């Protein structure tokens, strides 16, 4: 779910959804990893320096 503040407390709390795992925005280094697994499918060159774009 993307709104967790809204759901009432009987749906949350430990013993129901024990773990509450947060997702952070990709950090500046992760952007580099991310751009590189989607580009493999299409054509690439060595012109590109993914470090820049991240």
């Amino acid at each position: 779910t993307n709104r967790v503040d809204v759901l009432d407390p009987a749906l949350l709390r430990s013993g129901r959804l024990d773990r509450k795992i947060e997702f952070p925005l990709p950090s500046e280094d992760s952007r580099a990893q991310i751009l590189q697994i989607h580009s493999r499918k299409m054509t690439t060159d060595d012109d590109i320096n993914w470090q820049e774009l991240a």
Binding site: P9, A10, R13, G15
Partner: protein, 88 residues
């Protein structure tokens, strides 16, 4: 299965106030006849979510030995007109 009745702890006071309604008038309706009062029926358990209100009912229903109907409140609604009336 069975859950021990001391396996519920910390709430030892609420366990005793529940037995004043359920355990007592089953065995000794002679005590309530002395004062002259009609036995109490109907118990409402309420509290913050997760306090153990179901755990208390679970343990006491495996222990006492009386016939025990267990009913999710929302599980007896039916689509057809008044079929939910016949169940209750």
């Amino acid at each position: 299965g069975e859950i021990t009745f001391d396996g519920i702890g910390g709430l030892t006071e609420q366990i005793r106030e529940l037995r004043e309604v359920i355990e007592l008038p089953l065995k000794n309706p002679e005590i309530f006849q002395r004062v002259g009062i009609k036995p109490p029926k109907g118990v409402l358990l309420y509290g913050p979510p997760g306090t153990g209100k179901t755990l208390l009912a679970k343990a006491v229903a495996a222990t006492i030995g009386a016939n025990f109907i267990f009913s999710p409140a929302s599980g007896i609604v039916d689509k057809y007109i008044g079929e939910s009336a016949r169940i209750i």
